[PDB]
Amino acid sequence: MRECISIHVGQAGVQIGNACWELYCLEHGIQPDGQMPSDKTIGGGDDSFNTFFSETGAGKHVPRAVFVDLEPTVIDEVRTGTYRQLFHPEQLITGKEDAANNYARGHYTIGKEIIDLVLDRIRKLADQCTGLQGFLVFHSFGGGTGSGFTSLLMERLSVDYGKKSKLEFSIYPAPQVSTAVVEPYNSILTTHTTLEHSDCAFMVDNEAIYDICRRNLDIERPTYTNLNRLISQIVSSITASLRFDGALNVDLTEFQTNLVPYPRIHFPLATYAPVISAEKAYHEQLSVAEITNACFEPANQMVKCDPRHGKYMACCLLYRGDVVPKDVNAAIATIKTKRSIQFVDWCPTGFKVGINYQPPTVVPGGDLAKVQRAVCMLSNTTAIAEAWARLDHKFDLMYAKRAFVHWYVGEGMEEGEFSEAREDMAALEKDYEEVGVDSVE
Amino acid sequence: MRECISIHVGQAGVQIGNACWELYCLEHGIQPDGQMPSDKTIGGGDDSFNTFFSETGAGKHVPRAVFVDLEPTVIDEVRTGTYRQLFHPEQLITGKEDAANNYARGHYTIGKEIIDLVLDRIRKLADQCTGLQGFLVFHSFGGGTGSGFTSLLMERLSVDYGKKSKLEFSIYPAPQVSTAVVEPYNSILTTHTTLEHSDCAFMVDNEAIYDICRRNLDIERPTYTNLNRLISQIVSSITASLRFDGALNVDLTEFQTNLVPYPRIHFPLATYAPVISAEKAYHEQLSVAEITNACFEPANQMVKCDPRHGKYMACCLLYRGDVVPKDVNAAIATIKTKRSIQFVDWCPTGFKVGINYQPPTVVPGGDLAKVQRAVCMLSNTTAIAEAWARLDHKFDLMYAKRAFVHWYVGEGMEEGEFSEAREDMAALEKDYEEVGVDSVE
Amino acid sequence: MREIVHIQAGQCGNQIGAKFWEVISDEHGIDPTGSYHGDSDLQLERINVYYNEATGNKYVPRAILVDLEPGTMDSVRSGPFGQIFRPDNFVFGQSGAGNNWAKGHYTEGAELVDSVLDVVRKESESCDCLQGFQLTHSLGGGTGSGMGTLLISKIREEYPDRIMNTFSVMPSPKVSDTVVEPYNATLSVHQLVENTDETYCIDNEALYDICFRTLKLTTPTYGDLNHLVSATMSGVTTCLRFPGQLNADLRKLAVNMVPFPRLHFFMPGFAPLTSRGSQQYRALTVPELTQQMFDSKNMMAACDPRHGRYLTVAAIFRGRMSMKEVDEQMLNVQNKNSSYFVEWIPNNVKTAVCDIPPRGLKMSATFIGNSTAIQELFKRISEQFTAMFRRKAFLHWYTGEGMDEMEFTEAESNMNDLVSEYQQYQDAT
Amino acid sequence: MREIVHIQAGQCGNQIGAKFWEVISDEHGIDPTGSYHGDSDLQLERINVYYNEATGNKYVPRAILVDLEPGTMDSVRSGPFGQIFRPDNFVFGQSGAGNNWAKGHYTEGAELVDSVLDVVRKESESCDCLQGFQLTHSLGGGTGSGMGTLLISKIREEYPDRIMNTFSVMPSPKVSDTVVEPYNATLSVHQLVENTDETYCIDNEALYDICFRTLKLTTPTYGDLNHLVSATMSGVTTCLRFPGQLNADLRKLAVNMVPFPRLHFFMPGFAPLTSRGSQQYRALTVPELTQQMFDSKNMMAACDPRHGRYLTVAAIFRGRMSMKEVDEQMLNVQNKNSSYFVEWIPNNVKTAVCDIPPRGLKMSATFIGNSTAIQELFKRISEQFTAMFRRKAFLHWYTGEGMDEMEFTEAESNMNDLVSEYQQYQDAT
Ligand SMILES: CC(=O)O[C@H]1C(=O)[C@@]2(C)[C@H]([C@H](OC(=O)c3ccccc3)[C@]3(O)C[C@H](OC(=O)[C@H](O)[C@@H](NC(=O)c4ccccc4)c4ccccc4)C(C)=C1C3(C)C)[C@]1(OC(C)=O)CO[C@@H]1C[C@@H]2O
Ligand SMILES: CC(=O)O[C@H]1C(=O)[C@@]2(C)[C@H]([C@H](OC(=O)c3ccccc3)[C@]3(O)C[C@H](OC(=O)[C@H](O)[C@@H](NC(=O)c4ccccc4)c4ccccc4)C(C)=C1C3(C)C)[C@]1(OC(C)=O)CO[C@@H]1C[C@@H]2O
Ligand SMILES: Nc1nc2c(ncn2[C@@H]2O[C@H](COP(=O)(O)OP(=O)(O)OP(=O)(O)O)[C@@H](O)[C@H]2O)c(=O)[nH]1
Ligand SMILES: Nc1nc2c(ncn2[C@@H]2O[C@H](COP(=O)(O)OP(=O)(O)OP(=O)(O)O)[C@@H](O)[C@H]2O)c(=O)[nH]1
Ligand SMILES: Nc1nc2c(ncn2[C@@H]2O[C@H](COP(=O)(O)OP(=O)(O)O)[C@@H](O)[C@H]2O)c(=O)[nH]1
Ligand SMILES: Nc1nc2c(ncn2[C@@H]2O[C@H](COP(=O)(O)OP(=O)(O)O)[C@@H](O)[C@H]2O)c(=O)[nH]1
Ligand SMILES: [Mg+2]
Ligand SMILES: [Mg+2]
Structure with missing residues (x-):
């Protein structure tokens, strides 16, 4: 049976893992103590699907999850919370000190000597599965372990596994609001191994989801509990075809074939249709043509990024629930008519529709409610290049002044590592200028 | 199905929208909470017609209405009144300050930056409809947002929609009674975009409906609740053929073909037959020849305007209820005999009869009652030119003294805008002097 | 069939x-x-x-x-x-x-x-x-x-x-x-x-x-x-x-x-038209249907038939009849109305006799007649037209949909030639 | 068997x-x-x-x-x-x-x-x-x-x-x-x-x-x-x-x-296709099935059949029929559509008549037709292909599994030769 290995890294990765595994346990019926008392009433069905859940003989279910953060403070919430007895008790903590927001403590100093517990734990976990693999990595750019330790975890998993698909779901630094002053240093050093090893890098952002939680959801004070559920609804309908029974399922290998033209332009900028309130769950039809047109306006992109100032290359409409496959093509010939939704010449096909027909469920405790259908559009546009130039500019403004850099080179890393990461991002931004421009004859 | 988009603007537009949507909900059977418990007893009929009402799957009905006023004080009556849960919760308020009665705050200062919410909301509303469109705009001249913000809303909807019919129902400043001293400045600047963009401008007035509420209805103290119902009875029988089953229906495109000779003389001066009391609902036959002869006397025009001092060009008799089409032609050959009811040479056809046969209903709470038939005559006469010369004279008397004008040019607008709006109204009044005069040979 | x-x-x-x-x-x-x-x-x-x-x-x-x-x-x-x-x-x-x-x-x-x-x-x-x-x-x-x-x-x-x-x-x-x-x-x-x-x-x-x-x-x-x-x-x-x-x-x-191939604008009549319950004071015969068909207040085109000469007419009779009363009633009308028809046509009226009446009636008819009195239906419009067109009154709702002014003058030239080819035969010679 | x-x-x-x-x-x-x-x-x-x-x-x-x-x-x-x-x-x-x-x-x-x-x-x-x-x-x-x-x-x-x-x-x-x-x-x-x-x-x-x-x-x-x-x-x-x-x-x-051995790409039709409860306003006959089979809105290949000449077609009839109405309805279509077929073939349509209908129906059919109008299904792909292949767009998910670039040019050379051997017979001579 096809399966994934969800490897959360950092505090951002573990905090998202609080709610991704809160969502999975409610869809399948698994209580916070491993049992399945929902399907015992009916008496049939293996709904704790082996994509995400190892099953032991005593009826208990164990996830495929391992997470490393180099700080006990985050995981001790998991080891004392509601999901204490659910997970396996090897949630790898062992950090005698936090990374302190740098890539050099990090890829080199304390990420090493803890990685020996990490890779052996994945080998003890990967060898229980027959069939498809895929590493669902969860981290953030800008942090210390989400940037540094993931970079060590990719070059040590692109060797012991080779050509396996790696979907890594990174939280990207916002161009206007940054919760650290050294976050432009970490989010340029982590690109040098995201570009090489991880085949598909889902970037989301915190400011573009703040506006969604204010405008659509109408929440005036959104905490980090209410942001991570919206990423959790996205991550569910990315790996929904591996579990549920759809009319057009899209495997994790079918992303790599479709979303990714060239081996170094894999940054596809997820979206969703979260216009539930749920006061506005009435007053509104929410048909197939409605939720597909939610991707038109740049007030619903999950990244602070304007798609109208760039081409598209390839999109991937992934539906949920009561979707009829006829209504989809009405909502696609419409989009290919609109002249600001701009494509390149070299991709005339455009779209790809994955219709799963299990409806998205509702986490009790807010903040949206039971809609009958959804969409998670994944589209690598050319417009993500202007989202990086507002981050190379933050790097270059404090690289001329030689600021903050004695805590990077005084931890094992050489000071020449920074310009090696600048010559990628200068040349990787140069790649998006060529691909969007068509050739004339 | 054919449909309209009712866009109220200003406080005058929203206050009329309190009673236009009070009338529609009572004819079709829709309660103030979206349901239709009237037709559930019979069990058939789609009477919540899709001209005015979007239908969601939960049985609730949502109107086609959006209204912008740049002041929260007006719409917070709607958001707390009886029609709270009926409308969609995007009733666009967002004004941190009122317009303060000028065209420059207005078309330029605070009308801009709020219009970005407006046009996108219409696009989210227009793309749910297949077939006929028509923008039922509601505003007043003289005000700040009814004059200024409508002028920005017309030049931004004559580009994103092109050639769609726009029926805008303006309340015109009375020649004797004015509730503002700067109202002659606003009602000459709003003509420069009413003349160009809005294809058909229904002018009504407050003094000519005050006399109707005193003489016919016999109400000694008519508040603004009792005036807006008489406009609501007019607006119903303008867009009655789009809903109900008549013997001669008149589409909104059939107005443009008939009422409007030349592209800049579209000002047609509505009327009605409101001689109900309802003590005088007895004592009186109210036949077809009676209610058609109500347009003869200039004590029943809705504008303070004497039709006997001008020609007519084209009329449009629109009936309701128990009308037999034979009785109409008796009441028309009569009118073509009377020598003060004067036509031009170049229109020998004259009239056009639209017989809808659904009777006009009664809003409970006064002030008229159940008559069996009605008429809403729409006739662009030459006599409206003397209704403007009593407003250009109010403009010119305080333009020589350079009064009130530092709050117009000190808000972004140039002081040269005033003479550009005078050279229209001088030349537009010059157009009515040529059309009424026949050519001799 | x-x-x-x-x-x-x-x-x-x-x-x-x-x-x-x-x-x-x-x-x-x-x-x-x-x-x-x-x-x-x-x-x-x-x-x-x-x-x-x-x-x-x-x-x-x-x-x-x-x-x-x-x-x-x-x-x-x-x-x-x-x-x-x-x-x-x-x-x-x-x-x-x-x-x-x-x-x-x-x-x-x-x-x-x-x-x-x-x-x-x-x-x-x-x-x-x-x-x-x-x-x-x-x-x-x-x-x-x-x-x-x-x-x-x-x-x-x-x-x-x-x-x-x-x-x-x-x-x-x-x-x-x-x-x-x-x-x-x-x-x-x-x-x-x-x-x-x-x-x-x-x-x-x-x-x-x-x-x-x-x-x-x-x-x-x-x-x-x-x-x-x-x-x-x-x-x-x-x-x-x-x-x-x-x-x-x-x-x-x-x-x-x-x-002639342009002269094909007809005015239709019908008989018996009368107002009753079940007591009516008449008798349905072949001379009874005839006077009502030719009566100027039982046309449908709303022109006066006695203003012009009928070119030729057709009386499509129904019901059970007798052909002598059909061919002799159609004769006496043509002789009493010798100016009201065209002189230089041999017999103007033709006859058509079916054998099945309507459901309730016993006999019926249909007067289909080609007359020069329909010049009035085309002169009135051509006066109302050139009144509107002289001022170019309502034309911007038509030229704004693709037409040209040189199709309006084409259309009034054609209708004015029908009136010319109706005034001719209305005159005597 | x-x-x-x-x-x-x-x-x-x-x-x-x-x-x-x-x-x-x-x-x-x-x-x-x-x-x-x-x-x-x-x-x-x-x-x-x-x-x-x-x-x-x-x-x-x-x-x-x-x-x-x-x-x-x-x-x-x-x-x-x-x-x-x-x-x-x-x-x-x-x-x-x-x-x-x-x-x-x-x-x-x-x-x-x-x-x-x-x-x-x-x-x-x-x-x-x-x-x-x-x-x-x-x-x-x-x-x-x-x-x-x-x-x-x-x-x-x-x-x-x-x-x-x-x-x-x-x-x-x-x-x-x-x-x-x-x-x-x-x-x-x-x-x-x-x-x-x-x-x-x-x-x-x-x-x-x-x-x-x-x-x-x-x-x-x-x-x-x-x-x-x-x-x-x-x-x-x-x-x-x-x-x-x-x-x-x-x-x-x-x-x-x-x-010819390469010209074997067919477009299948079916008749009777219609929408009803149990009240439908038609009559299942042999000329009724024929017009629907040849109708351009009842193909399945999504090309316009009137853009090209049918090479030859096969009408596999079912149900109880009469062979004269089969052989004469297949004749009159070929004569009314003399440009829509190939002139230099004697008779284009063949007939196949079984004797057992489907379960609910009385008669049915199947239009299997070989046409040059299927040039459009191969020209559109060969334009979408050479748009993607010119940039070498998605090729590293294919050459990373063992292929070569010289198999892509082999495949587009073969499809472009079908369009050459369809444009020829679509032309007249
Ligand atoms: C007791 C009796 O004899 O009653 C007559 C009758 O009184 C009269 C007044 C009938 C009556 O007709 C009308 O009053 C009338 C109403 C509307 C429009 C036109 C006429 C009659 O209604 C009409 C009706 O006509 C028919 O039955 C014909 O077949 C007629 N049918 C219809 O028009 C028709 C009506 C309803 C439903 C279906 C068909 C017809 C005529 C020509 C071609 C086909 C059919 C008839 C003889 C009568 C009544 C019933 C009173 C007359 O009309 C006809 C068409 O016959 C009106 O003048 C004639 C003379 C008849 O004597
Ligand atoms: C009262 C009556 O006569 O009902 C008809 C009917 O109304 C119509 C509309 C039927 C109906 O078909 C459809 O509506 C339909 C649905 C999905 C896909 C295709 C068609 C019918 O459902 C289909 C059904 O077809 C059969 O029974 C054939 O044997 C057909 N069977 C199946 O497709 C089938 C369906 C379910 C289970 C098993 C088999 C068949 C055709 C070719 C080869 C083998 C079998 C028929 C005649 C009817 C109904 C029942 C309404 C029609 O279709 C067929 C295949 O006959 C649609 O247009 C035709 C014309 C028929 O008159
Ligand atoms: N959406 C979301 N973002 C988070 C969360 N926690 C941190 N972030 C974001 O992640 C970035 C900071 O990285 P962290 O993950 O906190 O850092 P870390 O990986 O623990 O690394 P060090 O603390 O530096 O060792 C900032 O941009 C935060 O806004 C969370 O729970 N949810
Ligand atoms: N019939 C009617 N007229 C109204 C109503 N409210 C205002 N008016 C008239 O409208 C004119 C004033 O314009 P308002 O609509 O109040 O002004 P506004 O559009 O809100 O603009 P500002 O307040 O200037 O920003 C005066 O002539 C009033 O008599 C109403 O509810 N009904
Ligand atoms: N008619 C029909 N088409 C299908 C069905 N499932 C997928 N498709 C079409 O098949 C193509 C996608 O290929 P698919 O069979 O799902 O991929 P595969 O499993 O890799 O062969 C698209 O053109 C779909 O529209 C089906 O059940 N019926
Ligand atoms: N006799 C008759 N005349 C009609 C009817 N309906 C409309 N008219 C006449 O038809 C003309 C108006 O045209 P109409 O058919 O309604 O417009 P259309 O839908 O644009 O073709 C006028 O002369 C009307 O008096 C009808 O049902 N019967
Ligand atoms: Mg941390
Ligand atoms: Mg106001």
């Missing part, structure tokens, strides 16, 4: 047409479901003409409905006979004409004529032999004036040898239910001179006159004006459907009734 | 195939357990064709299922007819193709074709004589495009003299459910020119069109597009299974229908 296709354009067209297929049905004895439950076997021999068969004993009219712009759709469907028309025939679009000619002939007509003629050809080849293309349309309006004469430009093009009768409701001198109406008559008579073999000029005033001056009806509704038109519409094709003693097709009329 | 093996590749393949064996079952009167409970004895004579016998009175289809990569496994097993297929036939692997051609033809196809052909040979030698190898696959996808044409490279190799029909669902000009789709069509038509005798070009747009323009269905699901395909799939082998008055094998079609 000889088969007819009935086309309905303009909202005036199907309203006459919905009453038309109720007169035809009760004349053949056919219920709303198409099941034949007639009295005799004599009315099954030519069901083939109007009603082609279906699977189990059911009959469907060959009725194309071009005019069901959706305000009229769910009234004709939700009517008396909405369960008799074939639902693929209901051909329409959205955003109807708007009492505009150019939005019937150039813009919305061009994006609908392909969907009509894909059903016209599928109703032609389900037939042994066609001759008839009845088009019930009206001048003055939108669809009935621009799109009604767009199909005749196409159907005569794909069928140059079919009898094309168009029962054309015309404007009035006083009853003006359309302000743009002298444009939709000038631009449509320009099409109906070139492209029809016969066309019947029917007005509403002479239908309002009969329901007051003769039938004494209190409130004549729109159903009771169409019930008089349809009694002529089933009176021209009577000899097609029923046996007789002197038959007349839609072509023995339109070879006799028309001298 | 003559026996057929049905192979199902790609996830589009068994979804059509699960509906396919439900139409075949109800045509022979066979329950989900394979127990025969039919009405007459006339449908047992050729159970041998599709259903070989089992121990106690039970029947098993000779259905190999290559495509059950395990997302589709426990839906076809847990379906209506999961208790009818032989469970050893469910041949699959792990880690399916991924909408990749090279992961269907070179990497996972090579480690599965040995396990398929070990079941193909065990279903060939349980037969008296084979002729038929039906392959229900789809272009555009993964398994259905690389592995579906890996078996045809092997099965035609081990059987050079069998009729190889592949009912190939093709890409669309607008409906793009696959971003890589102009690669999986170019690389698979390169295989299906060399290795098949006939292949039927079916699109989803012309199946979406019929369920809206003709069948008037509100929400056509994926079952109701396969229910139209399968009504053709049981319409080619009708004369094999049932007696007739002019029989036609899968080889009398594929000797007549194909002029």
